[PDB]
Design a binder for this molecule. Sequence first.
Ligand code: NA
Ligand code: NA
Ligand code: NA
Ligand code: NA
Ligand SMILES: [Zn+2]
Lengths: 145, 421
Amino acid sequence: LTPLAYKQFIPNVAEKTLGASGRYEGKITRNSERFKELTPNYNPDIIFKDADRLMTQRCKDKLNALAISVMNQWPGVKLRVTEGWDEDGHHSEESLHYEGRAVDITTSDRDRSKYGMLARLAVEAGFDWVYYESKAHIHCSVKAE
Amino acid sequence: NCFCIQEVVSGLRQPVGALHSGDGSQRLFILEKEGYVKILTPEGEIFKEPYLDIHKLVQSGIKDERGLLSLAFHPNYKKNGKLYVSYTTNQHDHILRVVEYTVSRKNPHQVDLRTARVFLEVAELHRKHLGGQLLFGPDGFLYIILGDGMITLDDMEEMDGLSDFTGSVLRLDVDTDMCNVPYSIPRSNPHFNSTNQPPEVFAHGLHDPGRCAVDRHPTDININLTILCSDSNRSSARILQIIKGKDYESEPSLLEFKPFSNGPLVGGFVYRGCQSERLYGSYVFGDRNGNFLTLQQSPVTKQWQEKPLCLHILGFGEDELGEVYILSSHNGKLYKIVDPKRPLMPEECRATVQPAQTLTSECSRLCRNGYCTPTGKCCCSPGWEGDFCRTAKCEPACRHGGVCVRPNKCLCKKGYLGPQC
Ligand code: NA
Ligand code: NA
Ligand code: NA
Ligand code: NA
Ligand SMILES: [Zn+2]
């Protein structure tokens, strides 16, 4: 397994193309009926920084599959989620974080060096779009219903 | 013992800083907070028409560091007429933008706004600790000092599209013959040819820097350039040293010492002027109340000594001759520092004023359907090729000795026919 380069993303296309995570339908709030597709992820093998556990199923799957890949990769190191669904603001419009289809992740030890390989693991985990967004975190996302 | 100041111009509109371009014209360009750059003749008069005017693009404010931040002329502006400006804009509180412009090839005293070419667009969450000071080094590369913008780690750890450039110094080679990119990265750079780090980053450790003094003639032999900054966040000063003939493999460390005493501090500078012989080589820093002081290290021991300098401040300036200026607060005016011990303009400081002339470079001359790099290369826009982008390029491209002329109209010589021959 070869790590992802800084500021590199897979697939090598725009996130909201059909090849990646697909188009963006709209922001998901609570008074919006579509809020029912979002459900908490109580995986004990994942660290939530912190309603940060709410997310779509395809996201839950890909994320749960990744949680294993991490501790399988490093000794006693878990998968850490810094941001998931955004209940309001904190993001630019049309961000998949508004649809619970996106997640920002790091390792438990905050070892920025591992981040490169982490992204790769997320790619093989089946994430529809992974992106080495910055030194501080990786951004992953999936498609919807 | 004491220094004196003489007024030069009033009625200024929220000045922030002033500088020259090194082209003989001895024009003093004055940056204004709200997005204007006015010119001051060597005589002392202000032009009617602004050199630059982008008050619409720049979103400033009073208090709040937003607005026109800094501007730096290319070392060869006399030939290429290239300049670089940093400012805040918006539509996330705002954006710190760094762009390259080019003076009108018709009028040397005004820039062609169409020649805008964006290099960096830094995301900003707040309106403090922005920085944005532009400057060139003896190496020729462009430096960019950026404050931390108060972007905590948590912020950058749970937010997308954040700078990742804030709180550090950047190194960009603007002299490139490459077209696919706005600029290139020096091999000297630490993170050059890297796969895990931003090649632009030269060093980090900044927070809320004022105007950093740039000593271009360090008293050292190995150190060819040194930059001294004053932070306030606590409060201290940090300086970055640089060697010309050195290929960095790692990050240059910022020296964090504490020379100053207690109070705040607007900024500083190193006197390179001719007017004063005693002030020569001395670092000078002042605060918003006109309280100044001088700094000086030592070849041996390398200790710093602080001596008070006898005499609302908004910024400083430096003409071609090296003479420093003060900008205070249409209330706003420019002053000039003068050493009473010597004449205002000694017989040796005299200099013939060569007026700014039109760009006569080869690129500025015959370069169409593209732009000129600071090195003179004409980067063709899509649909063009050849030295100066005159050779039309079809889609699909012409085959069998086919020559493109009209929009995608190939041209097959005798014996051939078809859309692409
Ligand atoms: Na404005
Ligand atoms: Na400058
Ligand atoms: Na290097
Ligand atoms: Na030197
Ligand atoms: Zn994200």
